[PDB]
């Protein structure tokens, strides 16, 4: 089981017993199965799913031709789902938030918000140097290694571009499903900026 949606935002919800939990609102307009991949043709089993209808002027002739089989408008996002029952799906089929039930345990995949160019202290959570006592070492990345190699070992972590990484959060709880609004309320927080792509899958660990 899987679906693609948009990170609408965050709020909080009161559950039965009065507990208050933070939830993330993720909207998922019904996704469409655009292509079925099989061992015979592609060598592996998976279903291609498209989401977020896209304006024709924003689409291309190749994209329109590709989505023609499913007979649907151009989709902004396309992703492949594995570990699904190929029998249950076929091109043109729709997938909605109702596929999940409240209390489901899911893996949520997103693209982390970007922080641009960041130093080692923030990027890797390394320790600063003393800020007084004559120290002239405040936010620097530490020694690069021993003398003997006459080089620097790989993985000597340094400053650079931070964020924008594919990150999966495992075992999040499906707080609520609103089929009317195509909304899923997921307990906790999820990676990605608002309006970014989010992928929900049935938790592999469970």
């Amino acid at each position: 089981k899987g679906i693609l949606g948009k990170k609408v935002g965050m709020t909080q919800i009161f559950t039965e017993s009065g507990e208050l939990i933070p939830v993330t609102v993720v909207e998922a307009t019904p996704n469409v199965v655009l292509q079925v991949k099989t061992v015979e043709t592609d060598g592996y089993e998976a279903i291609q799913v498209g989401y977020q209808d896209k304006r024709e002027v924003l689409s291309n002739k190749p994209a329109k031709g590709h989505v023609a089989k499913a007979n649907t408008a151009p989709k902004r996002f396309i992703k492949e789902f594995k570990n699904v029952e190929l029998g249950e799906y076929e091109v043109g089929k729709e997938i909605k938030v109702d596929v999940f039930q409240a209390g489901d345990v899911v893996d949520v995949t997103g693209t982390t918000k970007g922080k641009g160019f960041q130093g080692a202290i923030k990027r890797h959570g390394q320790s600063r140097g003393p800020m007084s006592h004559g120290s002239r070492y405040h936010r620097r990345p530490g020694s690069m290694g021993p003398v003997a190699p006459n080089r620097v070992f790989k993985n000597k972590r340094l400053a650079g571009r931070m964020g924008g990484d594919r990150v999966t959060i495992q075992n999040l709880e499906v707080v609520k499903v609103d089929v009317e609004r195509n909304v899923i309320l997921i307990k906790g927080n999820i990676p990605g900026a608002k309006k970014s792509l989010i992928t929900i899958k049935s938790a592999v660990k469970a």
């Binding site: 909080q12 009065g18 507990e19 208050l20």
Partner: protein
């Protein structure tokens, strides 16, 4: 958030007035202690006639903090000072009377005697 060198008032009549945190028990690298945590402390200032006296190493439980606690219902409690109660090893308070309010979290931490003795539990 109580850590080493943090000073706390004493909310009981055991004799001690102000204590200084020596250790935050419950872990090798634990840094901060909150309501319901037990700390090793030293008596820095003591009431002259009290049982507990200055310079003794004692165990105490935190009963209220400036940074208080969050409840499962989403509410919060905060106090205007950081106070603790000196306890024997079995959580029985050394003193006989408690001063000021106490947090309700001590109940699930099983400081029932302190909870009962407290003039008010919140």
């Amino acid at each position: 958030m109580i850590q080493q060198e943090s000073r706390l008032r004493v909310a009981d009549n055991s004799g001690a007035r102000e204590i200084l945190t020596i250790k935050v028990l419950g872990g090798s690298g634990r840094k901060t202690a909150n309501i319901g945590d037990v700390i090793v402390a030293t008596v820095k200032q003591a009431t002259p006639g009290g049982v507990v006296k200055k310079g003794e190493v004692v165990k105490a439980v935190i009963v209220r903090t400036k940074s208080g606690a969050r409840r499962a219902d989403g509410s919060y409690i905060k106090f205007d000072e950081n106070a603790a109660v000196i306890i024997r090893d079995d959580k029985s308070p050394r003193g006989t009377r408690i001063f000021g309010p106490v947090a309700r979290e001590l109940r699930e931490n099983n400081f029932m005697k302190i909870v009962s003795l407290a003039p008010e539990v919140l």
